Design a protein around this nucleic acid. Sequence first.
DNA 1: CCGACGTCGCATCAGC
DNA 2: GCTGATGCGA
DNA 3: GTCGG
Length: 326
Amino acid sequence: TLNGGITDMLTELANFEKNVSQAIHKYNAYRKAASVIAKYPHKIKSGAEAKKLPGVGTKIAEKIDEFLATGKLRKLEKIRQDDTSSSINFLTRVSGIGPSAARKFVDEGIKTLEDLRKNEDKLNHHQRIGLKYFGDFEKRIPREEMLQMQDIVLNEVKKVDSEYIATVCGSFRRGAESSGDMDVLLTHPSFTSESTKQPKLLHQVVEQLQKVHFITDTLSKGETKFMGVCQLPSKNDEKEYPHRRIDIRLIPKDQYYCGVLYFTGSDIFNKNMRAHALEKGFTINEYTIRPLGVTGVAGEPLPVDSEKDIFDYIQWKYREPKDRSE
DNA sequence: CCGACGTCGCATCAGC
DNA sequence: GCTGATGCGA
DNA sequence: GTCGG
Ligand SMILES: Nc1ccn([C@H]2C[C@H](O)[C@@H](COP(=O)(O)NP(=O)(O)OP(=O)(O)O)O2)c(=O)n1
Ligand SMILES: [Mg+2]
Ligand SMILES: [Mg+2]
Ligand code: NA
Ligand code: NA
């Protein structure tokens, strides 16, 4: 982090444009600028130096000159002092509250943590839980704890059916020394892109994890995606471990390589890879890479035998998980 | 200059 | 109920 | 907010 100051500022601006302006693209511009500056291995001495990097144009260059001359940014200073903006930025921090709900709550004079705690009747289910665990969700998970959770998830999965494969993804697979949450990709021979030969394949796993008091709550639940809460077990006299977000994704087993590429991220990396795919005339999702036809209707799934194949098709040198941290 | 810019799962709401 | 759009998050 | 065409 040769350029933490700069990338923080841009992240704050990305966050502002997302939560307050509801301008998703400006949010992307910023995340991207921040990303490209983050991997640039020099201490930036000027805005013009930055302007050079793809994704850094004029406005951001100007901001970078201001930031460097003064150590701060007047645009942000203002936004920080704005009441509506501080209020909306806060609320969206609660999981399940986005930009829209955040502005709606503010309108009704609900703007603090205490206002939320006293208005639980006005929150949907996701939002109630995000609020419940507001504090725990702010904390990072050390890898060491990620290893414990892994042991458990994989052992419980083994016990339900020995043919399940569960693979930890996200920032964990990218070798991070800490993670915001746990991401778990699931496969079972009975679920392929051809047929689902067995119902309740994700449910039986959620149930099992619930039954050992690992999954403590549910944010949302479908046939293929789970979003909920989990907690490591503590011993006698130990203060409890914090509650932690867990996402579980059941992917057809023959499409594992696309699923695992997707679920490994980063979010920015995925967006850059998919963008580049389209310029090469392909669309990648979590399932497949397909060609774009002459007018762009997506052709038939191309054969994929590893993560590398997907890189090959779009003419990208392979990148190990630890290098996809954009 | 000027749109074009990643892709999908689930929750929830509106209209029928 | 179904369809399709919007919100939110992966 | 940025940039390719
Ligand atoms: N907008 C997003 C968000 C996530 N994802 C994919 C890539 C992410 O690595 C993966 C898991 O989502 P995630 O948990 O929010 N992020 P990630 O695990 O990469 O970093 P952490 O905050 O978990 O430490 O979903 C995406 O493709 N587009
Ligand atoms: Mg994660
Ligand atoms: Mg996650
Ligand atoms: Na540039
Ligand atoms: Na939120």
